[PDB]
Symmetry: C2
Subunit: 234 residues, 2 copies
């Protein structure tokens, strides 16, 4: 009741904080117990945190997404963002937000990939693996039933909830493709993994990246050009 009420409110820093605090209280109750049942509860609670992250990405409130990590006490943070996932959460949020907003039609401006550290993170294979792990968690958190009661991704968007989830999960799948086919974008096997993409989403990506690359650092322009080329060849 109380929890469902929080989750249905308009997305604000206050409502996000109260929701996170509630999930943390449930998580904290499990920490002293190390049997399997507790691990299963904590897995589900983890997905509830990532549902809140993905919902803020989809509602174009990227600052609130980043904030979720801050609002979680460190002992819990160590389990919800294991290992290198803690370090690359900022980049994963940035990339997930960027691609979800392109899919939703947003006409920019997005921040520079080199400036925000995403370009550098891409250069490390272990950071690429951790970013992919987080993008996957964002996606599963809005597909699985993470709460025992249904909760629309975007507050007040009920009849169109399935449509929005479809769009957002397709966006996150493309964000995952960017990471997993870094510097192999136009290989035949890579292009085959774009078969899932609607033609209209593909065109929105092409148009967005064609504007984005203008004036950027040369290495970023080359990267974006490979992605555009792959989209046109698919």
């Amino acid at each position: 009741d109380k929890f469902t009420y929080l989750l249905l409110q308009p997305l604000t820093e206050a409502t996000l904080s109260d929701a996170v605090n509630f999930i943390v209280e449930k998580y904290s109750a499990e920490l002293p117990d190390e049997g399997d049942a507790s691990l299963v509860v904590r897995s589900q609670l983890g997905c509830q945190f990532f549902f809140l992250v993905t919902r803020t990405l989809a509602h174009d409130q990227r600052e609130l997404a980043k904030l979720v990590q801050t609002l979680i006490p460190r002992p819990v943070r160590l389990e919800v963002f294991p290992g290198l996932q803690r370090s690359v959460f900022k980049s994963s949020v940035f990339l997930g937000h960027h691609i979800i907003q392109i899919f939703m039609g947003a006409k920019k401006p997005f921040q520079d990939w080199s400036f925000v550290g995403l370009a550098q993170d891409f250069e490390c294979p272990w950071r690429r693996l951790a970013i992919a792990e987080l993008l996957k968690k964002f996606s599963v958190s809005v597909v699985e039933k993470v709460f025992d009661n249904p909760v629309a991704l975007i507050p007040q968007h009920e009849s169109d909830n399935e449509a929005l989830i479809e769009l957002v999960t397709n966006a996150l799948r493309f964000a995952l493709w960017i990471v997993e086919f870094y510097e192999t974008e136009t290989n035949e096997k890579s292009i085959k993994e774009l078969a899932f993409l609607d033609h209209s989403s593909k065109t929105l990506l092409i148009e967005s990246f064609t504007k984005f690359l203008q004036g950027k650092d040369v290495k970023d322009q080359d990267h974006l050009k490979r992605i555009i080329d792959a989209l046109e060849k698919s």
Copy 2:
């Protein structure tokens, strides 16, 4: 030198133990340090453990795969198998071994899915997520360069190393499909995600599962029949 020598020896309980002990020593050196650099080292070391797991699966030594978890001290185990991954490692090893061996042509017998606890694990969405996370780790560990020096997946199999890795990663991708499309196997969108599969591997799966289901518990037979149906419709 010493490490490369270990990794090139025939796979035995002794050689596996010595290899794990070496990686643990490197990991233990990182534990007191919590800056980003240490997290990156530990991510790579984690993938080295999973390379050893996948190599034992591919060499039909499933008992040695399970053993890797045992040979890792608990403080390290908490980071390498985070959260629920510790609980479902047994099932992930079982399923990964089963599917890799079908792809390699093995003519059985495999253990009963209900008897070994895999069927029960499938029933829980959070356990399904954790199994998928581990199957993905098995796959990336043999594709990425986890050691600074090249090391063939199967000792003495050098010229055919690329071929074996291709086969094993395709097998693990199909194991992942089984988990991620549990009880939605013959849906149109699910069948589209079988496009990656060679026709001959598809036939080997059909023949193997058709023998496997005989005499099994009815729920296991139904599950296997849905998988077979999906393969035939792809």
